[PDB]
Amino acid sequence: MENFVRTNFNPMILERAEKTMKEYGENPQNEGNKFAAISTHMEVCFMYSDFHFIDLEGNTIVKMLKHRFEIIEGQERNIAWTIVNSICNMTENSKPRFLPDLYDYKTNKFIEIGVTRRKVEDYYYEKASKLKGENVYIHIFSFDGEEMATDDEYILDEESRARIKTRLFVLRQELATAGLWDSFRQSEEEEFSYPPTFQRLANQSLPPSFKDYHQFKAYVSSFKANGNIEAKLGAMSEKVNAQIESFDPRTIRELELPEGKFCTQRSKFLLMDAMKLSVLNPAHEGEGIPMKDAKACLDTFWGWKKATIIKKHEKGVNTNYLMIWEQLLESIKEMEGKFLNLKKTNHLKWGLGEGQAPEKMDFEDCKEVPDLFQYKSEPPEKRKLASWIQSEFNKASELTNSNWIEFDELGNDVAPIEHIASRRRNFFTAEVSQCRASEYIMKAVYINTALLNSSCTAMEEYQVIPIITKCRDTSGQRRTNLYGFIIKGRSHLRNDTDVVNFISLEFSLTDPRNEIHKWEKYCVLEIGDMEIRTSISTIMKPVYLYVRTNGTSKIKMKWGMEMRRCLLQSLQQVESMIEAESAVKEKDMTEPFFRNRENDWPIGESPQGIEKGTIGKVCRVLLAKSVFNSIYASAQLEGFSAESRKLLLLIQAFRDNLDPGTFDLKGLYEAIEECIINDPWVLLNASWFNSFLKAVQLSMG
Amino acid sequence: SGMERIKELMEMVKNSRMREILTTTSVDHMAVIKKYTSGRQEKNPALRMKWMMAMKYPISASSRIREMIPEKDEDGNTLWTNTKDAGSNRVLVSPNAVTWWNRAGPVSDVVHYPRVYKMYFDRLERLTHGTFGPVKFYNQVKVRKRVDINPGHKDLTSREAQEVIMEVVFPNEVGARTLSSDAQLTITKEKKEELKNCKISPIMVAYMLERELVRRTRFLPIAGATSSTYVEVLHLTQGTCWEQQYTPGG
Amino acid sequence: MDVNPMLIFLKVPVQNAISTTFPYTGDPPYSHGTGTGYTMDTVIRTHDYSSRGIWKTNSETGAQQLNPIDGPLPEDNEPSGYAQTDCVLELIEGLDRSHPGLFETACQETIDAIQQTRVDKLTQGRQTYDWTLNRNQPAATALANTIEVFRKNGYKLNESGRLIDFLKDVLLSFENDSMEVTTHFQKKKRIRDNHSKKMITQRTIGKKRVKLTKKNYLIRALTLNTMTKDAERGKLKRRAIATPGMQIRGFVYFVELLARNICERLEQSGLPVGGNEKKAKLANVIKKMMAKSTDEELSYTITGDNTKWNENQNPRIFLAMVLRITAGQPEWFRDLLAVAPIMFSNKVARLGRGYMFESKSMHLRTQISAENLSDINLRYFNEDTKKKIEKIRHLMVEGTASLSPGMMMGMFNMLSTVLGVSVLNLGQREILKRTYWWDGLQSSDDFALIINGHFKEDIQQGVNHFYRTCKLVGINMSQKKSYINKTGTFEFTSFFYRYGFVANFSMELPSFGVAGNNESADMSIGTTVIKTNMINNDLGPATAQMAIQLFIKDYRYTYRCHRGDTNLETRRTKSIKRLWTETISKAGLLVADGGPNPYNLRNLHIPEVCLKWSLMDPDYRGRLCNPNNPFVHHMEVLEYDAVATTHSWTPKRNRSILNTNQRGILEDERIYQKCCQVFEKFFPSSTYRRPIGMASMLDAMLSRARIDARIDLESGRISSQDFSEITNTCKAIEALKRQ
RNA sequence: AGUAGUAACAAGAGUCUGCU
């Protein structure tokens, strides 16, 4: 049984038997015959193996030597097979089909020991027919005393064999006095139940007419459908229906744009109102270092005046901005080295927001504060659309004189599809490189790269970051442009949305008093005068400096550094147009797509009607659209695009005579106009959809 | 030869926590605690490399690099510094040290470097001696088929070449599996006859024989040839609306 | 002349230029602060779409549970969670009648894979809510914590090393009246910083053994941890996702394995498919629904989304489905597959991190947790949070809200696909015997529905029949965001079908920048990414060429490895130019060594060291591929010769937390690493192939050491003194093992 | 102040910076 095995044997045999029973999927508390049988096999094998040694010469001594037998039984099957493979690779013998019990180093033999309750002869012939085809020695014991090995040959001494026979006979006699020897000779799937806690959990996860999990399970298994769906459809209200309202774009309204104050500029740098101090072929012994090029571009401008606040930031302290510019210009005048870190004055501390966060404590100290109110979470205040963002997008699609993107080289083109792709890519790059959107890509890449490097190296420093770009002329001469300066605050960025505050000070020739709603967060000074040479006359125009406090995140800087995917996406759009053409015309339609020297594509809306342009204008407009998607990225733009895509596809389904229909069009209009709150670019996209809707309405009478 | 590792195991068993972990965790449970990572992860590794390469010493190397390269370059660049009171087997290293090693390091023999990566050199030989045809633009209808991204060896399936590899380089850990094919013993004998004079780790020649012998199939959208020498150039031979006719070398 | 890009749609169709409607070049929206509000939003919305159900009190957790199924039918077109059990069972029975042998073969393969699955399968995938630490840990970390807490108690069936015995231990651990856990505690001291000269609070995180109750352990075992989904496109407002725990993950794996076996044999399912397989399925259903017989067979298509898809499907409906699919199967299999809907029906939601509160007289702020949000006055909240807490106060059980109806985002995607495919399968011709018949395709929640008929009134009747049958089973079609047109153009999961031409825009285009591991790895990963986006995601060849150029530009910037003939002078440019000057064949230098770019469209499948090998200098290729290199870690047998280049170095790693000393909890990872290293010392193939065994690591290592000493002694490669030293060391290790 | 947007950052748990 169970208690006799623990009252009888050594703890080593019991530990080996418990390891084998836990490995094979048994237990001593459930089986008494199999546990005692495994203990009997282990005890016979251990008495077979122990007290046998091989000396330094080679003769078997029975009592600093080595053992004679290596035990393979009782070891785990991976451990035992490791021993078997190591022995079989030490000698030349092939592996047995199954695991033996012992290995004899002297005879070099795999010993198998089988102890049964029946006669020696029948169990021996069973194990001889089973272990057949290999040179595995067999040795069968029993409780009767007799033995029968392989061809009645025995490698062991007679004293040890008689000792194991005496141990087995004494074990049989102890089982006979215990009365358990009678049920010993007669002894020769998956389960997954629920414990009562999970059974009471299962009895509460049913449909409400049931109270037992097995009752509901028998109901599900013995279920037959008898028109239950139609019986529930006849009993449901008729107000649950999907009525198909017919869609006609001539009858639908336009998007309801919001009202209020005008939308202000919120880009991190000036786009079309930015002027640049440029040097041509710079060789000023810094040559690449940002502050050296900043001083080399600052030296090319004479005409600095005493700065005066000419347009106030209405919610701030404008004298602080004046002192910030004076301190910055004086520190650039006296700087030493490659980097400039400003002294943290009080106006710079106000302009960078130092001290504005409340001191974060743990709640266990601050339970006794009375006025502990939650952070308020208000929606954005709505803003009206102004013409400046349309003017900005108009300027961003135009050509410059500078080459703004320098691409690295490829491998040579050998495949014909590589020649086709290089022709397509060179057409797009010739039409797109001298664009203003490529200059904005360069500005954003440089600003976000420099802000990230300064934020992650100089966290406790008020570091001056000059807005630098570089370009090539039509003659290949290098030009280095300076647009302004960024004074970085303290940047201990832990989250992805933690804001580093900075101050941007940008040069400009545009008077801020002509469009004063655009410059809401800015404090514009008048720092100089420039003799601007026009085509005939030479005028003296004032040079302003737009100063504002801005802020950015690690995620925003990360996406600003990856700004050439705008160039990837615009090329992807133009190439998908070419691919959808060539999938029907069945030839390389790249050359009748870029060599169209006529205007074929509607891209504008003058007061005289709708204006067309060439394919290079279209690729520059697609680049500018991707760039403005990258600059004014918001959740409003994402939601508006995802919701108005459906209305665009409905208008396309109308134009294809595919008879479009809707189910709740007012809900779709509310979902579109919910995402139009205060961002200038999403307001311009809403106005663009309204203009396209009016155009496709007037196209069909 | 067997004594230092058992003395290291004895010094680990003298620690109580290592002894409890070694005695309680099994050989099948040490595939779970092999990936036990506890600490603050990084969400932007690309941005981390961006701002870490701008620092002076982004590379983490061993202590032997204290005696293999100098401290200072020829141009005055400090190739390596120490850590803050860490005399361990790890220092900090600038990539100027890597450029130093590539321009003024010790030249060796690299005769085993082609034969480990013979699959990639075979791909380069098929691409260099391939002949392209005219592109044909039409509506490409690619069907998802189970195709052979690695042809492997003949007379060896995917569950049998792995047993050949387990026989060749890790012979005392094959378990109960035997060699049940006449080609298996010949391939095993040849691969053991090759890989004897080699100071390369057995995992690397195991992956070498894996990319030489173990066949790999994968579902891929193909409209054309489904051979193994055409699966690898699927990016080059077809697209959405075209087809690059190609004949590989051989 | 004001520019408008949308007027491009006047010439080209919308599906030909649909890429302009995806502003995926800027940053996606992120959530700032906690996600308690979105969690309470989901709880309130799920209890309000089901509010005509029956309220009960759970006898085991004490949580209020709402039962909406087999309740009153919906009276309007609002989202409703009153799914009918008989209608669900009728649809699954019809799906079985339509596909003979589908359920039997899928259940057979699930039984085949249950018995041949280790616990290591739970180390793969997303992160997991560790109930020990009340946080999210990685999968292997939370699994090791679960196994350690189970085996420190009396639950050691997982020592078998297969998944079902671990699940048996999970279900057995619910009976323990006092579970002993090892939770991270924290000591706080106030230290003046030496740089800023400011009083910070240094936190020392250690370990502490705590004694949970039966109720506390069951609440923690039923918990889903909620957090806001960040970087999600196409939406204005944020939503909360949830991560499961360790007590439910294996059961969810078995149920999703069964439903994945179902959905692969179904034609009308868009899961689990890839990029071109979904295009082929779109072409297949448009082909099969355009077989006209009479003079005028009308055919329409609904591009349909579902509104509040996870908020309305009950776990009890999934229980009925998983008991109807597993029909004629053994009861252990039915109970094992039914555990996970029972656990999701009794589940609870952890409410996030709490809220930040602000004292404007003391000028302080404090993050108070979601457990502390109960015993605080309602005057200190704002209006939305006061409404949320008033609606949620009766559902709170020990920091967590009882979310008994509904699901969460991405738990049973394939089972919900099975239910949607059963609704789609109802509308065959000679099953309905009607004037209309529908076919189509079903994703997780998105669907495309082709309805054929004879008149447009029959099309309307078919739309109404499909809609009301969906409302019977708790599926709510979004009327605001679905539309219908004639067959030939539609959209399915941002796949845009127009007359055969399919535009794939389901995936965002990657940055094609540096990956951030090392130089050689980023080069290989970048070329492989360009190649796989060419093959799978329809990347055009010129866009791929510009992607190679942008990747080489970003790679040369990031590792400061511009070419030797450049005029940029970075930190590394002097050594790179010295390498450039003394190199004869400059075409063989790698891009990380200042060499040219070799890549184009034709050789993306070839690594860079192999691609430039014929062009290298012999001295340069000897120095670059020197096997005695000091940058790559060497493993001992003296060590082996390396077969990797010197650009496979290792960046300086940093996992430090501000003002946090966590060396008391980071020791166990180093101990596990040292144990794995010494086991790989004793076993050469523990890192090429995973080792098996129910024996201990120490028993296996000593059994290897004794037999290797005996084999080296019997082969003459060792002396008897070393043999005796090894055997005495093994005896000493065994004696310290037993003591 | 500013970033920002349904809740937060605006510090105290998450020796460095060069893209023609």
Automatic annotation (TrEMBL), chain A:
This is Polymerase acidic protein. Mn(2+) binds at H41, D101, E112, I113. Mg(2+) 3 binds at E73, D101, E112. GO terms for molecular function: metal ion binding; RNA binding. Belongs to the influenza viruses PA family. Keywords: Eukaryotic host gene expression shutoff by virus, Host gene expression shutoff by virus, Host-virus interaction, Metal-binding. Influenza RNA polymerase is composed of three subunits: PB1, PB2 and PA. InterPro entries: PA/PA-X (IPR001009), PA/PA-X_sf (IPR038372). The gene is PA. It comes from Influenza A virus (A/little yellow-shouldered bat/Guatemala/060/2010(H17N10)). Mg(2+) 2 binds at E73, D101. The keyword Cell inner membrane does not apply. GO terms for biological process: symbiont-mediated suppression of host gene expression; viral RNA genome replication; viral translational frameshifting. Mg(2+) 1 binds at H41, D101, E112, I113. It comes from the Viruses. The keyword Metal-binding applies.
UniProtKB/TrEMBL annotation, chain B:
Belongs to the influenza viruses PB2 family. Residues 39-107 form the Influenza RNA polymerase PB2 second domain. Influenza RNA polymerase is composed of three subunits: PB1, PB2 and PA. Keywords: Cap snatching, Eukaryotic host gene expression shutoff by virus, Eukaryotic host transcription shutoff by virus, Host gene expression shutoff by virus, Host nucleus, Host-virus interaction, Inhibition of host RNA polymerase II by virus, mRNA capping, mRNA processing, Viral transcription, Virion. Residues 109-250 form the Influenza RNA polymerase PB2 middle domain. This is Polymerase basic protein 2. It comes from Influenza A virus (A/little yellow-shouldered bat/Guatemala/060/2010(H17N10)). Plays an essential role in transcription initiation and cap-stealing mechanism, in which cellular capped pre-mRNAs are used to generate primers for viral transcription. One of its GO terms (cellular component) is host cell mitochondrion. It is found in: Host mitochondrion; Virion; Host nucleus. Its main location: host cell. Residues 3-38 form the Influenza RNA polymerase PB2 N-terminal region domain. One of its GO terms (molecular function) is RNA binding. One of its GO terms (biological process) is DNA-templated transcription.
UniProtKB/TrEMBL annotation, chain C:
Mg(2+) 2 binds at G304, D446. Its EC number is 2.7.7.48. GTP binds at N413, D446. It is found in: Host cytoplasm; Host nucleus. Mg(2+) 4 binds at D305, D445, D446. Mg(2+) 3 binds at D305, N306, D445. One of its GO terms (molecular function) is GTP binding. One of its GO terms (cellular component) is host cell cytoplasm. It catalyses: RNA(n) + a ribonucleoside 5'-triphosphate = RNA(n+1) + diphosphate. GO terms for biological process: symbiont-mediated suppression of host gene expression; symbiont-mediated suppression of host mRNA transcription via inhibition of RNA polymerase II activity; viral RNA genome replication; viral transcription. Residues 286-483 form the RdRp catalytic domain. Mg(2+) 5 binds at D446, E491. Keywords: Eukaryotic host gene expression shutoff by virus, Eukaryotic host transcription shutoff by virus, GTP-binding, Host cytoplasm, Host gene expression shutoff by virus, Host nucleus, Host-virus interaction, Inhibition of host RNA polymerase II by virus, Metal-binding, Nucleotide-binding, Nucleotidyltransferase, Phosphoprotein, RNA-directed RNA polymerase, Transferase, Viral RNA replication, Viral transcription. Mg(2+) 1 binds at G304, D305, D446, E491. It holds the Pfam family Flu_PB1. The keyword Isomerase does not apply. CTP binds at R239, K308, W309, N310, G410, K481. RNA-dependent RNA polymerase which is responsible for replication and transcription of virus RNA segments. The transcription of viral mRNAs occurs by a unique mechanism called cap-snatching. 5' methylated caps of cellular mRNAs are cleaved after 10-13 nucleotides by PA. In turn, these short capped RNAs are used as primers by PB1 for transcription of viral mRNAs. During virus replication, PB1 initiates RNA synthesis and copy vRNA into complementary RNA (cRNA) which in turn serves as a template for the production of more vRNAs. This is RNA-directed RNA polymerase catalytic subunit. It comes from Influenza A virus (A/little yellow-shouldered bat/Guatemala/060/2010(H17N10)).
